[PDB]
Nucleic acid binder design. Structure first.
Lengths: 108, 146, 67, 83, 297, 119
RNA sequence: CGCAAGGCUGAAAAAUUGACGGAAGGGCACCACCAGGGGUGGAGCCUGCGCGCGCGCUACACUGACAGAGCCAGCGAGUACUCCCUUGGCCGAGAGGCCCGGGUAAACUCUGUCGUGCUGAGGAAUCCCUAGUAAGCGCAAGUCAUCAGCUUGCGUUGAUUACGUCCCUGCCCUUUGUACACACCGCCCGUCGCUACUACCGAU
């Protein structure tokens, strides 16, 4: 039980460390650090697998209306060197008419 | 040992064996990391004499240490004093008395003494989707990165 | 393994999947295509056969003859 | 020739597979070997019992084919490893 | 067409999940049918589940037909089981060596409806595309180590399972001299299997024996002169290719003609060769505490 | 269901009914006469109609948008255009319901993916 | 708990449907012909299999060397990856860290300088190959089995010659069935088994 063990039974076991001749390589990965790595990598692989399923089961003839009001990813050929598969997002700046620029420049 | 080159799963291990003879004796062996990853010594390597190939569960890190837990047989020594106390007898001294007698310090390893580890809060890199996949997936799940 | 082969070949039991006739469903006896109470139950079976002819006609016409 | 056809030809020459002879034919035979023949036939028609080279010898020299039994060698080495 | 194959794969997986749910139900319906014809009392939940009573009165007949074996299970092979002749091609890896090419020719001779295709520069999606385009039943890869094969990947089509197996103790056809061997007899072979009892073993037996053409059943027990054997011990399925002649009523003479393998399966994926992300069905569980004590198949 | 369970014509017509309904995509399975008893549904037929099946195939955003489109005559199935929004697409035609040849919708999709081939 | 669980004993058939063929006629096959190509087999390295054998790898010159100029890929992103081991020296009571020494392509194209010079492309045999195939070329990854002496991907350059024929070598199948019109074809052959009946021979 829990009252059938001594305090020396309950005494914690110390955690060893990286040897000093090898401290430059980083921290020594024990079980808890390993579980952190396994959760992170399994989560990223799960999301990448779901994206691969989506890209496979893509219908090639879909039509929303964001396709009328956005700038699609294109290809490496069309987008040139600055080509990430993501669609460019609106930074919020826009084209300003001449009258408003006159007003702003008068204030400046 | 210590990892030498680390692929996704398989890893070459250097400072554990001295020759392909010893490795071919220990072929098919159940090697184990400190992190808890099991693994298997599979085949000797050739060009550096003594290195080998191990197949692990998941990717081991260059900071890891690979251990192999074997069981070596030990036999006691066959000493026997009789303690003929009325006649006289030689009493073997102990370890601490031997050391205090002939002035040798007790051996210690600075690798072995317990110290405190400093663990920084492990943060990971974000997801990094490849370009062709991020270009090819449909409109409902296209990533938007300004 | 050689003995098991000899046993199988002598008391022949091969696990080969055998060629079934393609129309065992609609033609159970496999007749040749050339020159050639229980009354209540048979009446009920005739009724269901008529019902199925009618509903299959309706279902094909609703599917616009893609079936 | 194929394996099946060569085996059938060898057995018909050995008289183990031939047509069902009459009593007169049995009398003729009893009026007028096969063990060693059959052992040669099984040895030659189960050729994966022993490792063989297909090219033959590299340079033909004449003076006066199996090249090792891997199953028999493995059984013998395993018995030695036992003992 | 590729839209159609994707649609059928999705519908088959959805019907699989539906069969899972309905089998969890029909475990409980069968106790009702057995208690009816017997009279042994049954569980009160079974007796007072009213929806089960209505659905049971509707669907008695399928359970009885399954008991009599008249109907088949929803499977990737029961559609085209023994109606067509399942043709199959064998290829090598990217850069084949000469002994691997000869070995692929040997097993292309082993399957009587097989063709062999050179890889050359043939991207693996284009391979799967071409197979689904020419209605092939199955595809086979081979991986050499150095002139000696080490892996097969039996992949069924259009969306069936794959079996990835490692080979050992292989001896090729092309080492014995032509004076002793010869052209192998291409006839529709019989198949004998030994040691498979588990559902996994039955799955492997099905996806292995659906690579061979179906035999005419009128005199199959007596005619035919070539047999192929698959026996397993400790889930390493060992296969030989014999050709035999029946010298008597009570004795037969053998003659080993094909290669010998002891292939050990290390994966079965419910999903074809291109789909590395397919849901696995069984893989060689090593590096566990008892993965070497447990015996599958 | 009302026939006795051991009757050959009952079994043959059960398998026929289930196969016909599953090929016409009303049902989801082909093993339950109970699913025919309380799953065949005018809602199932309605979702097998054209605008909702192209909604599931993501031709359009909503069912109203799909109905407006195929009333404008943008959507063929096979090779013939369809102007009636009541056409019932079966499970073999769901793989073939596409846009029409010179559609402004097809041009807009191509312009989104930046692969607009003006030839 | 009971049955199973008492040794004329001492290792190496069925057949009215069966056994084996023959002749003719078809079909198929880079395990066949035909035309070409390419390996291995020559020298060295080594995994493997049983000193030998193959499989790969490297080297062997006109298809040259050197120097310039220009121009092309695809798959690849786990807070993760490093090839050593040491001479010295800094800061280190001690364990170490520093500093210095030693051991996104190949290709291709164009333009010039020079000129065959141990600076020699593989016998008998045997195996394979018919369109993005052979072959040349590099880049990536290392995925629970196999694989670093390597394995699998991926892109690039991309031909010659058949694509007919059963003549040779083989393999399969017809001579029974499985469908009806026109139209044609017209009793394939041998040696025995088994069965019914008939009489015969000689012992008891």
């Amino acid at each position: 039980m829990s009252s059938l063990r001594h305090a020396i039974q309950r005494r914690a076991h110390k955690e060893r460390a990286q040897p000093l001749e090898r401290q430059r390589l980083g921290i020594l990965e024990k079980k808890k650090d390993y579980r952190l790595r396994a959760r992170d990598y399994k989560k990223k692989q799960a999301v990448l697998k779901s994206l691969r399923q989506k890209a496979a089961e893509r219908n090639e003839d879909e039509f929303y209306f964001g396709m009328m009001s956005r700038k699609g990813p294109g290809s490496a050929l069309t987008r040139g060197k600055g080509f990430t598969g993501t669609v460019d997002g609106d930074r919020g700046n826009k084209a300003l008419s001449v009258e408003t620029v006159r007003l702003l420049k008068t204030q400046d | 040992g210590t990892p030498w080159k680390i692929f996704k799963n398989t890893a070459f291990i250097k400072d554990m064996f001295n020759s392909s003879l010893e490795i071919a004796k220990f072929e098919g062996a159940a090697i184990r990391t400190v992190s808890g990853i099991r693994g298997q010594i599979k085949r000797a390597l050739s060009k550096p004499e003594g290195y080998f190939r191990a197949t692990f569960e998941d990717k081991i890190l260059l900071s890891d240490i690979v251990i192999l837990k074997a069981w070596y047989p030990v036999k006691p020594k066959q000493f026997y004093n009789p303690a003929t106390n009325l006649i006289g007898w030689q009493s073997m001294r102990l370890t601490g008395e031997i050391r205090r007698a002939e002035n040798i310090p007790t051996p210690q390893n600075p690798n072995s003494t317990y110290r405190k580890i400093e663990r920084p809060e492990r943060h990971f890199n974000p997801l990094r989707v490849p370009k062709n996949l991020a270009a090819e997936l449909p409109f409902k799940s296209q990533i938007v990165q300004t | 393994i050689e003995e098991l082969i000899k046993r199988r070949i002598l008391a022949g039991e091969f696990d080969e999947v055998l060629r079934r006739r393609p129309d065992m469903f609609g033609n159970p006896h496999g007749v040749r295509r050339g020159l050639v109470a229980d009354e209540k139950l048979r009446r009920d079976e005739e009724e269901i056969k008529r019902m199925w002819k009618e509903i299959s006609a309706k279902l094909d016409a609703l599917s616009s003859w893609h079936y | 020739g194929s394996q099946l056809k060569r085996l059938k030809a060898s057995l018909r020459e050995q008289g183990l597979i031939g047509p069902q002879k009459s009593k007169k034919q049995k009398r003729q035979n009893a009026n007028d070997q096969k063990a060693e023949a059959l052992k040669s036939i099984r040895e030659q028609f189960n050729p994966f019992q022993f490792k063989t080279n297909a090219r033959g010898p590299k340079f033909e020299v004449t003076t006066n084919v199996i090249k090792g039994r891997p199953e028999l060698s493995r059984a013998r080495s395993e018995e030695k490893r036992r003992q | 067409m590729l839209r159609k194959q994707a649609r059928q794969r999705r519908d088959y997986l959805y019907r699989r999940a539906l069969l899972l749910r309905d089998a969890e139900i029909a475990e409980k319906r069968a106790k009702l049918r057995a208690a009816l014809a017997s009279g042994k009392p049954l569980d009160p939940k079974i007796a007072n589940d009213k929806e089960l009573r209505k659905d049971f009165d509707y669907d008695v007949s399928r359970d009885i037909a399954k008991e009599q074996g008249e109907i088949d299970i929803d499977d990737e092979y029961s559609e085209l089981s023994g109606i067509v002749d399942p043709r199959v091609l064998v290829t090598t890896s990217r850069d084949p060596s000469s002994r691997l090419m000869a070995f692929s020719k040997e097993i292309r001779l082993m399957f009587p409806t097989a063709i062999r295709l050179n890889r050359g520069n043939l991207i693996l999606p284009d391979l799967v595309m071409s197979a689904q385009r020419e209605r092939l039943s199955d595809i086979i890869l081979l991986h050499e180590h150095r002139g000696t094969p080490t892996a097969i990947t039996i992949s069924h089509f259009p969306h069936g399972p794959t079996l990835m197996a490692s080979l050992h103790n292989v001896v090729l056809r092309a080492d014995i001299p032509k004076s002793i061997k010869g052209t192998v007899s291409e006839s529709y072979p019989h198949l004998i299997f030994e040691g498979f009892r588990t559902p996994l073993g039955q799955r492997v037996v099905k996806i292995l024996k659906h690579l061979f053409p179906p035999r005419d059943p009128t005199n199959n027990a007596k005619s035919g002169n070539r047999v192929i054997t698959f026996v397993n011990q400790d889930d390493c399925i060992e296969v030989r290719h014999h050709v035999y002649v029946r010298t008597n009523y009570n004795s037969v003479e053998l003659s080993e003609v094909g290669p010998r393998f002891t292939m050990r399966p290390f994966s079965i994926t419910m999903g074809t060769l291109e789909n590395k992300d397919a849901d696995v069905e069984w893989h060689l569980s090593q590096y566990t505490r008892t993965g070497r004590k447990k015996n599958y198949f | 269901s009302l026939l006795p369970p051991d009757n050959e014509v009952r079994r043959k017509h059960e398998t026929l009914l289930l196969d016909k309904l599953y090929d016409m995509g009303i049902l989801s399975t082909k093993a339950k006469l109970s699913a025919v008893e309380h799953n065949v549904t005018v809602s199932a037929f309605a979702r097998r109609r054209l605008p909702v099946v192209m909604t599931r195939l993501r031709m359009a955003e909503t069912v109203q948008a799909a109905t407006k489109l195929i009333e404008q005559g943008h959507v063929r199935v096979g090779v013939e255009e369809v102007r009636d929004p009541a056409f019932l697409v079966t499970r073999n035609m769901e793989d073939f319901v596409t846009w029409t040849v010179g559609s402004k919708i097809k041009q807009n999709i191509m312009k989104y993916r930046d692969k607009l081939d003006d030839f």
